[PDB]
Amino acid sequence: MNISTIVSNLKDLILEVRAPYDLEITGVSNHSSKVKKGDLFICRREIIPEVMEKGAVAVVVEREIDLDFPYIQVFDSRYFEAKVASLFFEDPWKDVLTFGVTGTNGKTTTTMMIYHMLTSLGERGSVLTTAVKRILGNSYYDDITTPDAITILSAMKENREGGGKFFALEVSSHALVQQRVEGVRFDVGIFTNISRDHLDFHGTFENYLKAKLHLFDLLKDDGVAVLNESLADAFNRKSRKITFGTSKNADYRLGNIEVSWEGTQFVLETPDGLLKVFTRAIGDFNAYNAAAAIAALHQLGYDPKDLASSLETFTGVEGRFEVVRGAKKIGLNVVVDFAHSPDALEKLLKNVRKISQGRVIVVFGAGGNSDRGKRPMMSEVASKLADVVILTTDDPRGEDPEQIMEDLIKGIDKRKPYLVLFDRREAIETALTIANRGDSVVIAGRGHERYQIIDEEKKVPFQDREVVEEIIRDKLKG
Ligand SMILES: Nc1ncnc2c1ncn2[C@@H]1O[C@H](COP(=O)(O)OP(=O)(O)O)[C@@H](O)[C@H]1O
Ligand SMILES: [Mg+2]
């Protein structure tokens, strides 16, 4: 990539070029920590001198630099980033069936199903969500809540070069703001749901919604919008719509949801046929995720029946309704989830409620340095929908843990039996003991998380699911 190529292709973003038509560019980077030699560095709104010695050929910037150094000055750094990136990796999206999945809820599950449902129906590609990155064959499991434009596009160019014709990507409501995914074009576009409350919230609801529709700008004029029925009319653009839902007039229409410890069983009316679907993952919410997929997928002449038979193998996402099926070995069934909203909490308990023929006991705490006030109402939820509530320490990052517990304690209905134990290890041990023949013990807050973060920097090992299994191995022992 010449600078001549950049300027040429992307001229209108660029305000002023003070740089040789020459400076071949070898890579792109956003953090100083990460600069290679020859890369172009993009300075987001002192460091300039630093990043140049580290080996930077030139630097993008939003205001006048005034330094001896080769620099493209742009109208909007962050946008520019996306766009450049798309070039330097050479638009990896044209060659690969790309999927973007946004919504308030169900991003990860829906994306992961797509992923699973393609590999499983034979095929090779790549997924990239919050919870699971699989870069080609590799499941490079690691640090992916802080990806930018370059990291995503990077990872789509491994996919294509390594010969996969599809990339399944979760489009965070966050990420549409960054503009992380602005240099992309998607072949399909799933929009799962939208909350009218004050979950996932920026402005009013219209600002909240509009920003989530933007995805469909970023959509190939070839490809399709896969929409929730309840958002039918909101679709302000002019492209292919496929609806799903329960209304009798949605393109794909899902029916008799039947959640049980074997999983969600539902019945989906495709607009050419009709079929049983069984996912193994538990939760009624899992039917609008499944439906959204069998739609998007089958909107490319994949035989439905066969797609539907895919979902059978899908056993949820690690840390999301993870049943410790290995607990029946005692006398109990145990659920690990990650719920850190009043909301996910409620959904969970209702589902364990439906599915559980017995008492439901809930171990949870709250994370340091999220909302301080959404805390006592998290307890409020659990105080209602659960027979016994065991309150334990979570990841009190910065926060002093006993100054979290106070905040949580207010929402507990003091009339019902609640129990407070500040050591997660003992909370869990206890709940297993006080719970009976065939009760359900649910542990929330953490999920697949691998350490408990007490100190900003000082953290001990604690895998929620595993400690459970540990205590069970120990009880059975004697
Ligand atoms: N279609 C849906 N409608 C309502 N709630 C959902 C849906 N899909 C998932 N959820 C719930 O929302 C929470 C987060 O969903 P998740 O699959 O993690 O998407 P995200 O990655 O956007 O959080 C989960 O605890 C789950 O119970
Ligand atoms: Mg998420």
Short mmCIF file of C-alpha atoms and ligand atoms in Angstrom, two decimals:
data_model
loop_
_atom_site.label_atom_id
_atom_site.label_comp_id
_atom_site.label_asym_id
_atom_site.label_seq_id
_atom_site.Cartn_x
_atom_site.Cartn_y
_atom_site.Cartn_z
CA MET A 1 0.00 0.00 0.00
CA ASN A 2 1.40 3.28 -1.23
CA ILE A 3 0.16 6.43 0.38
CA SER A 4 -0.88 7.06 -3.24
CA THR A 5 -3.34 4.21 -2.90
CA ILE A 6 -4.80 5.57 0.34
CA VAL A 7 -5.43 9.17 -0.76
CA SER A 8 -6.61 7.85 -4.14
CA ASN A 9 -9.28 5.42 -2.77
CA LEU A 10 -10.27 7.37 0.34
CA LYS A 11 -9.74 10.92 -0.77
CA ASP A 12 -12.79 12.61 0.61
CA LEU A 13 -12.24 11.66 4.23
CA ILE A 14 -8.78 13.19 4.05
CA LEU A 15 -8.36 16.86 4.85
CA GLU A 16 -4.65 17.44 4.22
CA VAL A 17 -1.89 15.12 3.06
CA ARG A 18 1.57 16.23 4.16
CA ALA A 19 3.32 13.03 3.06
CA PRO A 20 5.26 11.47 0.14
CA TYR A 21 3.17 9.68 -2.41
CA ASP A 22 5.79 7.05 -1.62
CA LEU A 23 5.86 5.84 2.00
CA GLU A 24 4.82 2.24 1.43
CA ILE A 25 2.71 1.24 4.43
CA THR A 26 3.29 -2.14 6.06
CA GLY A 27 0.58 -2.23 8.73
CA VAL A 28 -1.84 -0.18 10.79
CA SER A 29 -2.06 0.44 14.55
CA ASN A 30 -4.03 2.38 17.12
CA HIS A 31 -2.22 1.79 20.43
CA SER A 32 1.41 2.84 20.99
CA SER A 33 2.11 -0.44 22.80
CA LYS A 34 1.38 -2.19 19.49
CA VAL A 35 3.28 -0.29 16.76
CA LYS A 36 5.36 -2.33 14.36
CA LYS A 37 8.01 -0.92 12.03
CA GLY A 38 6.48 0.63 8.91
CA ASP A 39 2.98 0.75 10.34
CA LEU A 40 0.74 3.84 10.11
CA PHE A 41 -0.28 5.14 13.52
CA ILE A 42 -3.68 6.72 14.14
CA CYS A 43 -3.73 9.23 16.94
CA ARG A 44 -7.11 9.30 18.72
CA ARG A 45 -8.50 12.32 20.57
CA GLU A 46 3.58 14.15 22.95
CA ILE A 47 2.87 10.55 21.94
CA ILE A 48 3.59 11.39 18.29
CA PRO A 49 7.35 11.65 18.93
CA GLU A 50 7.17 8.38 20.86
CA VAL A 51 5.28 6.33 18.30
CA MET A 52 7.66 7.46 15.52
CA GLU A 53 10.82 6.12 17.16
CA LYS A 54 9.03 2.84 17.82
CA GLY A 55 9.05 2.41 14.02
CA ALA A 56 6.08 4.31 12.57
CA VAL A 57 6.24 5.41 8.90
CA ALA A 58 3.45 8.02 9.32
CA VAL A 59 0.69 9.20 11.63
CA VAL A 60 -3.05 10.08 11.13
CA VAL A 61 -4.40 13.02 13.16
CA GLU A 62 -7.53 15.18 13.60
CA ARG A 63 -5.86 18.54 14.30
CA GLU A 64 -2.71 20.30 13.09
CA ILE A 65 0.36 18.42 14.29
CA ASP A 66 3.24 20.84 13.62
CA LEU A 67 6.08 18.28 13.72
CA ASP A 68 8.69 17.19 11.17
CA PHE A 69 6.83 13.89 10.77
CA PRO A 70 4.88 12.42 7.78
CA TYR A 71 1.20 12.80 8.55
CA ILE A 72 -2.29 12.51 7.05
CA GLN A 73 -4.76 14.80 8.78
CA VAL A 74 -8.35 13.57 8.65
CA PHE A 75 -11.80 14.89 9.46
CA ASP A 76 -12.63 11.95 11.77
CA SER A 77 -9.76 9.78 13.02
CA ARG A 78 -11.91 6.90 14.24
CA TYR A 79 -13.97 6.66 11.08
CA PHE A 80 -10.91 6.98 8.95
CA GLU A 81 -9.44 4.04 10.87
CA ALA A 82 -12.24 1.69 9.84
CA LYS A 83 -12.03 2.71 6.22
CA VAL A 84 -8.24 2.46 5.81
CA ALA A 85 -8.19 -0.85 7.61
CA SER A 86 -10.70 -2.28 5.06
CA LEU A 87 -8.21 -1.42 2.30
CA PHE A 88 -4.91 -2.47 3.84
CA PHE A 89 -6.38 -5.94 4.47
CA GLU A 90 -8.05 -5.69 1.07
CA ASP A 91 -11.79 -5.91 1.84
CA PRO A 92 -11.84 -9.45 3.28
CA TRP A 93 -15.64 -9.29 3.34
CA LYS A 94 -16.32 -9.50 -0.49
CA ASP A 95 -15.16 -13.10 -0.66
CA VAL A 96 -16.70 -14.37 2.61
CA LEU A 97 -20.38 -14.69 3.74
CA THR A 98 -20.40 -12.17 6.56
CA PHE A 99 -22.97 -12.00 9.37
CA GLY A 100 -23.56 -9.11 11.74
CA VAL A 101 -25.78 -9.61 14.75
CA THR A 102 -27.05 -6.76 16.91
CA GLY A 103 -29.91 -6.25 19.25
CA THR A 104 -30.13 -5.66 22.94
CA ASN A 105 -30.10 -9.35 23.70
CA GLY A 106 -29.19 -12.64 22.14
CA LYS A 107 -26.26 -11.35 20.15
CA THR A 108 -23.87 -13.99 21.40
CA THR A 109 -26.20 -16.93 21.36
CA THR A 110 -27.58 -16.21 17.92
CA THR A 111 -24.09 -15.66 16.47
CA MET A 112 -22.73 -18.81 18.04
CA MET A 113 -25.59 -20.85 16.64
CA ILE A 114 -25.02 -19.58 13.14
CA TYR A 115 -21.38 -20.50 13.63
CA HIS A 116 -22.20 -23.91 15.03
CA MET A 117 -24.94 -24.48 12.50
CA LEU A 118 -22.65 -24.00 9.53
CA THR A 119 -19.58 -25.90 10.62
CA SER A 120 -22.05 -28.59 11.69
CA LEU A 121 -23.82 -28.60 8.31
CA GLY A 122 -20.29 -28.88 6.96
CA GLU A 123 -18.31 -25.74 6.14
CA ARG A 124 -15.46 -23.69 7.51
CA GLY A 125 -15.30 -20.12 8.76
CA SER A 126 -14.87 -18.01 11.82
CA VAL A 127 -16.72 -16.36 14.72
CA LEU A 128 -15.99 -13.31 16.85
CA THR A 129 -18.24 -12.25 19.73
CA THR A 130 -17.58 -11.09 23.29
CA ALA A 131 -17.38 -14.55 24.78
CA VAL A 132 -15.90 -16.65 22.02
CA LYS A 133 -13.42 -15.90 19.29
CA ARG A 134 -12.57 -18.63 16.78
CA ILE A 135 -10.15 -17.07 14.34
CA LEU A 136 -10.06 -19.93 11.80
CA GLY A 137 -9.44 -23.38 13.11
CA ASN A 138 -7.86 -21.88 16.24
CA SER A 139 -10.09 -20.98 19.07
CA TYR A 140 -7.76 -18.18 20.10
CA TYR A 141 -9.71 -17.77 23.43
CA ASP A 142 -8.56 -14.46 24.90
CA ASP A 143 -8.94 -10.69 25.38
CA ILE A 144 -11.93 -9.57 23.22
CA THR A 145 -14.11 -6.88 24.84
CA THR A 146 -11.66 -4.19 23.58
CA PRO A 147 -11.36 -4.90 19.86
CA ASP A 148 -11.18 -1.92 17.48
CA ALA A 149 -11.63 -1.70 13.71
CA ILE A 150 -8.20 -3.06 12.80
CA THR A 151 -8.41 -6.18 15.03
CA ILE A 152 -11.76 -7.23 13.56
CA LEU A 153 -10.69 -6.62 9.96
CA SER A 154 -7.39 -8.24 10.69
CA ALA A 155 -9.25 -11.35 11.75
CA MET A 156 -11.43 -11.48 8.65
CA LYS A 157 -8.35 -11.51 6.50
CA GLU A 158 -7.07 -14.63 8.31
CA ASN A 159 -10.45 -16.15 7.62
CA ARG A 160 -10.40 -15.49 3.86
CA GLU A 161 -6.74 -16.22 3.16
CA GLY A 162 -7.08 -19.37 5.29
CA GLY A 163 -10.02 -20.31 3.03
CA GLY A 164 -13.28 -19.82 4.99
CA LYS A 165 -16.33 -18.42 3.16
CA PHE A 166 -18.02 -16.94 6.23
CA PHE A 167 -17.39 -14.78 9.23
CA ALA A 168 -19.89 -14.53 12.11
CA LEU A 169 -19.56 -11.34 14.05
CA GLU A 170 -21.37 -9.88 17.07
CA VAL A 171 -22.10 -6.22 16.57
CA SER A 172 -22.07 -4.65 20.07
CA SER A 173 -24.27 -1.60 20.59
CA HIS A 174 -21.07 -0.12 21.98
CA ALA A 175 -19.22 -1.11 18.77
CA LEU A 176 -21.54 0.82 16.48
CA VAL A 177 -20.43 3.96 18.33
CA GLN A 178 -16.71 3.35 18.07
CA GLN A 179 -17.64 2.74 14.49
CA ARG A 180 -15.53 -0.41 14.91
CA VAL A 181 -17.36 -2.13 12.10
CA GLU A 182 -17.85 0.72 9.65
CA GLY A 183 -15.47 -0.49 6.95
CA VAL A 184 -17.42 -3.73 6.65
CA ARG A 185 -20.28 -4.84 4.49
CA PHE A 186 -22.45 -7.70 5.57
CA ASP A 187 -24.24 -10.28 3.52
CA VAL A 188 -26.84 -10.79 6.23
CA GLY A 189 -27.96 -8.61 9.11
CA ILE A 190 -29.70 -9.94 12.15
CA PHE A 191 -31.50 -7.68 14.58
CA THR A 192 -32.72 -9.73 17.44
CA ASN A 193 -34.57 -7.56 19.94
CA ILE A 194 -34.74 -4.08 21.46
CA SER A 195 -35.48 -3.11 25.06
CA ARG A 196 -37.77 -0.12 25.78
CA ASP A 197 -36.66 0.15 29.43
CA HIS A 198 -33.26 1.52 30.53
CA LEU A 199 -31.07 -1.51 29.88
CA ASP A 200 -28.15 -0.91 27.42
CA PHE A 201 -29.09 2.81 27.38
CA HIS A 202 -27.65 5.99 25.86
CA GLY A 203 -30.27 8.68 24.99
CA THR A 204 -34.01 8.30 24.66
CA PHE A 205 -35.42 5.25 22.93
CA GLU A 206 -35.37 6.74 19.43
CA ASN A 207 -31.62 7.51 19.65
CA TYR A 208 -31.16 4.07 21.14
CA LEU A 209 -33.05 2.47 18.25
CA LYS A 210 -31.82 4.52 15.28
CA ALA A 211 -28.22 3.74 16.27
CA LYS A 212 -29.03 0.02 16.19
CA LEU A 213 -30.55 0.30 12.71
CA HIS A 214 -27.35 1.77 11.39
CA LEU A 215 -26.06 -1.77 10.94
CA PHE A 216 -28.30 -2.00 7.91
CA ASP A 217 -26.52 0.80 6.19
CA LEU A 218 -23.43 -1.43 6.44
CA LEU A 219 -25.19 -4.15 4.52
CA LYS A 220 -24.36 -5.35 0.98
CA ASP A 221 -27.04 -4.29 -1.51
CA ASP A 222 -26.98 -7.99 -2.42
CA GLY A 223 -27.85 -9.08 1.11
CA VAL A 224 -30.74 -9.20 3.52
CA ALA A 225 -32.05 -7.73 6.78
CA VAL A 226 -33.26 -10.32 9.24
CA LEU A 227 -35.63 -8.54 11.58
CA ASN A 228 -37.77 -9.08 14.60
CA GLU A 229 -41.49 -8.91 13.86
CA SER A 230 -42.04 -6.29 16.58
CA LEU A 231 -39.68 -3.94 14.67
CA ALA A 232 -41.41 -4.43 11.32
CA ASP A 233 -42.38 -0.83 10.63
CA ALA A 234 -39.30 0.74 12.23
CA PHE A 235 -37.16 -0.38 9.30
CA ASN A 236 -36.44 3.06 7.86
CA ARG A 237 -34.37 1.79 4.91
CA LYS A 238 -35.18 -0.04 1.67
CA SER A 239 -33.68 -3.51 1.48
CA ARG A 240 -34.78 -7.12 1.83
CA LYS A 241 -36.68 -7.73 5.11
CA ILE A 242 -37.18 -11.14 6.67
CA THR A 243 -39.27 -11.02 9.86
CA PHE A 244 -39.45 -13.69 12.57
CA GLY A 245 -41.56 -13.92 15.72
CA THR A 246 -44.94 -15.08 16.94
CA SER A 247 -47.31 -12.71 15.18
CA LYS A 248 -49.19 -14.59 12.47
CA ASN A 249 -47.73 -12.33 9.81
CA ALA A 250 -44.00 -12.71 10.38
CA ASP A 251 -42.00 -14.41 7.63
CA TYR A 252 -40.73 -17.08 10.07
CA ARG A 253 -43.12 -17.78 12.90
CA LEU A 254 -42.24 -19.70 16.03
CA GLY A 255 -44.75 -21.57 18.19
CA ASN A 256 -44.97 -24.10 21.01
CA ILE A 257 -41.93 -23.35 23.09
CA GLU A 258 -41.33 -26.11 25.65
CA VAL A 259 -38.43 -25.54 27.99
CA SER A 260 -37.23 -28.49 30.10
CA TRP A 261 -33.83 -29.76 31.38
CA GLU A 262 -33.32 -31.43 27.99
CA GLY A 263 -33.65 -27.97 26.35
CA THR A 264 -35.90 -25.61 24.42
CA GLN A 265 -38.23 -27.48 22.05
CA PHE A 266 -40.19 -25.19 19.68
CA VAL A 267 -42.10 -25.36 16.40
CA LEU A 268 -41.12 -22.98 13.56
CA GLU A 269 -43.28 -22.08 10.56
CA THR A 270 -40.99 -21.34 7.62
CA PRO A 271 -42.70 -19.61 4.74
CA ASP A 272 -42.34 -22.71 2.54
CA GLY A 273 -42.86 -25.44 5.15
CA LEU A 274 -42.92 -26.06 8.91
CA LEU A 275 -40.75 -28.06 11.36
CA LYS A 276 -39.95 -29.12 14.93
CA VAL A 277 -36.83 -27.52 16.28
CA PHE A 278 -35.03 -28.76 19.35
CA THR A 279 -32.07 -26.88 20.71
CA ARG A 280 -30.34 -28.44 23.67
CA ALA A 281 -29.69 -25.08 25.34
CA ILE A 282 -32.28 -24.14 27.99
CA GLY A 283 -34.42 -20.99 27.82
CA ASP A 284 -37.52 -19.81 25.99
CA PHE A 285 -35.48 -16.80 24.78
CA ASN A 286 -33.48 -19.41 22.89
CA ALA A 287 -36.33 -19.91 20.40
CA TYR A 288 -36.21 -16.36 18.99
CA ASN A 289 -32.45 -16.82 18.70
CA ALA A 290 -32.79 -20.12 16.87
CA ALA A 291 -35.56 -18.71 14.63
CA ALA A 292 -33.46 -15.70 13.72
CA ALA A 293 -30.76 -18.10 12.62
CA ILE A 294 -32.77 -20.76 10.68
CA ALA A 295 -34.13 -17.70 8.89
CA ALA A 296 -30.89 -15.83 8.01
CA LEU A 297 -29.25 -19.14 7.19
CA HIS A 298 -32.09 -20.63 5.16
CA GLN A 299 -32.37 -17.33 3.26
CA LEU A 300 -29.57 -18.90 1.29
CA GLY A 301 -31.30 -22.12 0.17
CA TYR A 302 -29.80 -24.30 2.91
CA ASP A 303 -32.40 -27.03 3.36
CA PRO A 304 -34.35 -26.11 6.56
CA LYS A 305 -34.92 -29.64 7.90
CA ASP A 306 -31.11 -30.08 7.90
CA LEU A 307 -30.42 -26.70 9.50
CA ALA A 308 -33.04 -27.58 12.16
CA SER A 309 -31.23 -30.83 12.81
CA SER A 310 -28.13 -28.74 13.42
CA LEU A 311 -29.58 -27.01 16.43
CA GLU A 312 -29.87 -30.36 18.14
CA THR A 313 -26.12 -30.58 18.64
CA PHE A 314 -25.89 -27.00 20.00
CA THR A 315 -25.53 -27.06 23.80
CA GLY A 316 -25.53 -23.35 24.68
CA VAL A 317 -22.59 -21.06 25.28
CA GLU A 318 -20.12 -21.62 28.05
CA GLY A 319 -21.26 -19.58 31.03
CA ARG A 320 -24.86 -19.25 29.78
CA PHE A 321 -27.31 -21.59 31.52
CA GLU A 322 -24.45 -24.05 31.99
CA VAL A 323 -26.05 -27.03 33.71
CA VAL A 324 -23.76 -28.97 36.00
CA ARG A 325 -25.35 -32.16 34.82
CA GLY A 326 -22.64 -33.77 36.93
CA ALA A 327 -24.48 -32.72 40.11
CA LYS A 328 -27.38 -35.16 39.90
CA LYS A 329 -24.57 -37.41 41.23
CA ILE A 330 -25.44 -35.87 44.60
CA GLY A 331 -29.17 -35.21 44.53
CA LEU A 332 -29.36 -31.74 43.10
CA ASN A 333 -29.21 -29.92 39.82
CA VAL A 334 -27.06 -26.84 39.58
CA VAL A 335 -26.98 -23.99 37.10
CA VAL A 336 -24.08 -21.66 36.44
CA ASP A 337 -24.89 -18.35 34.74
CA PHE A 338 -23.31 -14.88 34.38
CA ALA A 339 -26.26 -12.50 35.09
CA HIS A 340 -25.02 -9.02 36.10
CA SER A 341 -28.23 -7.08 35.36
CA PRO A 342 -31.57 -7.11 37.26
CA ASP A 343 -32.82 -8.35 33.93
CA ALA A 344 -30.71 -11.39 33.05
CA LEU A 345 -31.27 -12.34 36.67
CA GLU A 346 -35.05 -12.32 36.25
CA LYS A 347 -35.06 -14.20 32.95
CA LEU A 348 -32.83 -16.91 34.43
CA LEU A 349 -34.86 -17.52 37.60
CA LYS A 350 -38.13 -17.68 35.64
CA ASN A 351 -36.57 -20.32 33.43
CA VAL A 352 -35.19 -22.36 36.32
CA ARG A 353 -38.60 -21.84 37.79
CA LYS A 354 -40.47 -23.38 34.78
CA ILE A 355 -37.96 -26.12 34.34
CA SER A 356 -37.52 -26.92 38.09
CA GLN A 357 -39.91 -29.22 39.92
CA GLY A 358 -38.69 -28.12 43.34
CA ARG A 359 -37.02 -25.37 45.36
CA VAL A 360 -34.76 -22.74 43.74
CA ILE A 361 -31.82 -21.33 45.69
CA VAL A 362 -29.70 -18.48 44.38
CA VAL A 363 -26.07 -17.66 45.04
CA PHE A 364 -24.98 -14.24 43.77
CA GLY A 365 -23.10 -10.99 44.37
CA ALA A 366 -22.43 -7.85 42.32
CA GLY A 367 -19.44 -6.53 40.39
CA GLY A 368 -17.44 -3.53 41.59
CA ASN A 369 -17.69 -0.39 39.47
CA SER A 370 -20.78 -1.05 37.44
CA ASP A 371 -24.02 0.77 38.36
CA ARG A 372 -24.16 1.29 42.16
CA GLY A 373 -27.92 1.77 42.19
CA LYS A 374 -29.02 -1.09 39.96
CA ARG A 375 -27.64 -3.26 42.80
CA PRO A 376 -30.31 -3.25 45.50
CA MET A 377 -32.84 -3.99 42.77
CA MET A 378 -30.87 -6.98 41.63
CA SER A 379 -31.55 -8.38 45.08
CA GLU A 380 -35.15 -7.25 44.83
CA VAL A 381 -35.54 -9.49 41.78
CA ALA A 382 -33.91 -12.51 43.42
CA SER A 383 -35.77 -11.87 46.71
CA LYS A 384 -39.03 -12.43 44.79
CA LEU A 385 -38.38 -15.20 42.28
CA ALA A 386 -36.24 -17.41 44.55
CA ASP A 387 -36.91 -19.50 47.64
CA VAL A 388 -33.58 -18.85 49.43
CA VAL A 389 -31.13 -16.10 48.51
CA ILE A 390 -27.47 -16.59 49.39
CA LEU A 391 -25.49 -13.43 49.16
CA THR A 392 -21.81 -13.66 48.41
CA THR A 393 -18.80 -11.65 47.28
CA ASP A 394 -18.25 -11.38 43.54
CA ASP A 395 -15.48 -9.36 41.84
CA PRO A 396 -15.16 -6.34 44.10
CA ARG A 397 -12.60 -4.83 41.78
CA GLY A 398 -11.79 -1.40 43.08
CA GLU A 399 -14.72 -1.29 45.45
CA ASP A 400 -14.47 -2.26 49.11
CA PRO A 401 -16.60 -5.49 49.18
CA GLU A 402 -18.52 -4.65 52.42
CA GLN A 403 -19.54 -1.39 50.76
CA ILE A 404 -21.02 -3.44 47.95
CA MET A 405 -22.83 -5.82 50.23
CA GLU A 406 -24.54 -2.95 51.99
CA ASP A 407 -25.85 -1.69 48.63
CA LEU A 408 -27.12 -5.18 47.77
CA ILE A 409 -28.71 -5.77 51.19
CA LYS A 410 -31.33 -3.02 50.80
CA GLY A 411 -33.21 -4.86 47.99
CA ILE A 412 -33.54 -8.07 49.95
CA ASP A 413 -37.02 -8.57 51.31
CA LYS A 414 -35.98 -9.08 54.95
CA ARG A 415 -39.18 -11.12 55.57
CA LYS A 416 -38.10 -14.12 53.46
CA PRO A 417 -35.07 -16.29 54.43
CA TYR A 418 -31.82 -14.69 53.15
CA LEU A 419 -28.36 -15.63 54.15
CA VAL A 420 -25.16 -13.59 53.92
CA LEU A 421 -21.69 -15.23 53.46
CA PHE A 422 -18.74 -13.13 52.28
CA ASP A 423 -16.63 -15.93 50.88
CA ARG A 424 -17.78 -17.18 47.52
CA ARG A 425 -16.27 -20.57 48.27
CA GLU A 426 -18.45 -21.01 51.41
CA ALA A 427 -21.56 -19.47 49.87
CA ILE A 428 -21.48 -22.18 47.25
CA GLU A 429 -20.58 -24.96 49.69
CA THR A 430 -23.44 -23.84 51.95
CA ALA A 431 -26.11 -23.65 49.26
CA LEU A 432 -25.32 -27.16 48.20
CA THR A 433 -25.84 -28.39 51.78
CA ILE A 434 -29.05 -26.56 52.71
CA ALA A 435 -30.64 -27.55 49.42
CA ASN A 436 -32.66 -30.73 49.34
CA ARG A 437 -33.57 -33.76 47.33
CA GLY A 438 -33.95 -32.38 43.82
CA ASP A 439 -33.76 -28.68 44.50
CA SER A 440 -32.04 -26.35 42.09
CA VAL A 441 -29.05 -24.30 43.03
CA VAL A 442 -28.26 -21.39 40.76
CA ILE A 443 -25.00 -19.45 40.97
CA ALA A 444 -24.92 -16.13 39.17
CA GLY A 445 -22.66 -13.16 38.56
CA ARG A 446 -19.53 -14.65 37.05
CA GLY A 447 -20.03 -17.40 34.48
CA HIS A 448 -16.99 -18.71 32.61
CA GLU A 449 -14.76 -16.07 34.22
CA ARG A 450 -11.43 -17.61 35.21
CA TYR A 451 -10.23 -15.44 38.14
CA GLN A 452 -12.00 -13.59 40.93
CA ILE A 453 -10.81 -9.94 40.70
CA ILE A 454 -10.45 -8.64 44.30
CA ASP A 455 -7.70 -6.09 43.71
CA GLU A 456 -7.37 -3.86 40.66
CA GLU A 457 -4.20 -5.91 40.57
CA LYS A 458 -4.32 -8.98 42.79
CA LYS A 459 -6.50 -11.92 41.80
CA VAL A 460 -6.99 -15.54 42.89
CA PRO A 461 -8.20 -18.47 40.77
CA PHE A 462 -11.95 -19.17 40.94
CA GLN A 463 -13.83 -20.86 38.11
CA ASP A 464 -17.47 -20.78 39.19
CA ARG A 465 -18.48 -24.05 37.49
CA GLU A 466 -15.38 -25.89 38.60
CA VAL A 467 -15.37 -25.15 42.29
CA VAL A 468 -18.90 -26.62 42.21
CA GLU A 469 -17.70 -29.78 40.55
CA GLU A 470 -14.83 -29.80 43.13
CA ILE A 471 -17.17 -29.72 46.13
CA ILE A 472 -19.29 -32.47 44.62
CA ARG A 473 -16.24 -34.69 44.06
CA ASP A 474 -15.48 -34.09 47.68
CA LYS A 475 -19.00 -34.85 49.04
CA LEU A 476 -19.33 -38.05 47.06
CA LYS A 477 -15.84 -39.04 48.25
CA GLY A 478 -17.53 -39.63 51.65
N1 LIG B 1 -33.90 -13.07 22.03
C1 LIG B 1 -33.75 -12.72 23.33
N2 LIG B 1 -34.70 -12.00 23.95
C2 LIG B 1 -34.59 -11.64 25.24
N3 LIG B 1 -33.53 -11.96 26.00
C3 LIG B 1 -32.49 -12.69 25.52
C4 LIG B 1 -32.55 -13.12 24.12
N4 LIG B 1 -31.41 -13.81 23.89
C5 LIG B 1 -30.69 -13.82 25.05
N5 LIG B 1 -31.33 -13.15 26.03
C6 LIG B 1 -30.87 -12.92 27.44
O1 LIG B 1 -30.01 -11.78 27.55
C7 LIG B 1 -28.83 -12.03 28.31
C8 LIG B 1 -27.65 -11.61 27.45
O2 LIG B 1 -27.83 -12.17 26.15
P1 LIG B 1 -26.58 -12.64 25.25
O3 LIG B 1 -26.88 -13.88 24.43
O4 LIG B 1 -25.33 -12.59 26.11
O5 LIG B 1 -26.49 -11.42 24.24
P2 LIG B 1 -25.45 -10.28 24.63
O6 LIG B 1 -24.13 -10.87 24.21
O7 LIG B 1 -25.96 -9.14 23.80
O8 LIG B 1 -25.60 -10.12 26.13
C9 LIG B 1 -28.83 -13.53 28.61
O9 LIG B 1 -28.75 -13.72 30.03
C10 LIG B 1 -30.13 -14.10 28.03
O10 LIG B 1 -31.00 -14.68 29.02
MG MG B 2 -22.57 -9.70 25.36
#
